[PDB]
Amino acid sequence: MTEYKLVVVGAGGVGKSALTIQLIQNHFVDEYKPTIEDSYRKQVVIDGETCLLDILDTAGQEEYSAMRDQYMRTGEGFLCVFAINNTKSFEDIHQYREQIKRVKDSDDVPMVLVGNKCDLAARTVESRQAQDLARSYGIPYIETSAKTRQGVEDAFYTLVREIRQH
Ligand SMILES: Nc1nc2c(ncn2[C@@H]2O[C@H](COP(=O)(O)OP(=O)(O)NP(=O)(O)O)[C@@H](O)[C@H]2O)c(=O)[nH]1
Numbered sequence: 001m002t003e004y005k006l007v008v009v010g011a012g013g014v015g016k017s018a019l020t021i022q023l024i025q026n027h028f029v030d031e032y033k034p035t036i037e038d039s040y041r042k043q044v045v046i047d048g049e050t051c052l053l054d055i056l057d058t059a060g061q062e063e064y065s066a067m068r069d070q071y072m073r074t075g076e077g078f079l080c081v082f083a084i085n086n087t088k089s090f091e092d093i094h095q096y097r098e099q100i101k102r103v104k105d106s107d108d109v110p111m112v113l114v115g116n117k118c119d120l121a122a123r124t125v126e127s128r129q130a131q132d133l134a135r136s137y138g139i140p141y142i143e144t145s146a147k148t149r150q151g152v153e154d155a156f157y158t159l160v161r162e163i164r165q166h
């Protein structure tokens with residue numbers, strides 16, 4: 001069966017791990033257990049396709065940008081995560097995207113943009129700003145909350161759709 005190699009990137013604490021764990025383990029981690037790196041997989045169904053989703057959950061905590069390089073090479077698709085309550089994380093997106101394009105030596109890498117933490121009243125990034133940012137990338141935008149699981153499958157699964165149509 002098709003294995004899809006998803007990698008989760010984005011600034012420190014936007015909810016990369018929470019998204020992955022909600023996807024994989026169906027529980028809200030509810031803890032900044034700052035990541036070093038973690039590999040997960042789950043057999044899932046996407047558009048009727050039973051497939052495997054491998055998720056490489058990466059340390060956004062930008063002290064390991066050089067660890068990220070070698071490790072991202074492996075990924076086929078990338079979830080670019082910010083938190084809708086952290087504009088600095090939204091600005092940080094350009095960097096992660098650029099690095100990924102660098103690493104894969106391609107302007108057109110399967111990717112999605114993810115605004116996480118949409119349960120939070122504290123929105124500082126408009127949905128339309130992120131939709132526009134994704135559009136400027138020619139990639140999907142998904143809004144999620146790892147807390148409530150709202151949009152979580154959508155984020156990883158829409159990235160599978162990117163990998164496929166690539
Ligand atoms: N309310 C809410 N909180 C969230 C959400 N996602 C993550 N959090 C919380 O915010 C904190 C940071 O989440 P985490 O998943 O560790 O961030 P990260 O991007 O994986 N961290 P790093 O790059 O260092 O590994 C945790 O307390 C976590 O429970 C969300 O969708 N909603």
Ligand SMILES: [Mg+2]
Nearest residue numbers: 016017034035
């Ligand atoms: Mg993490």
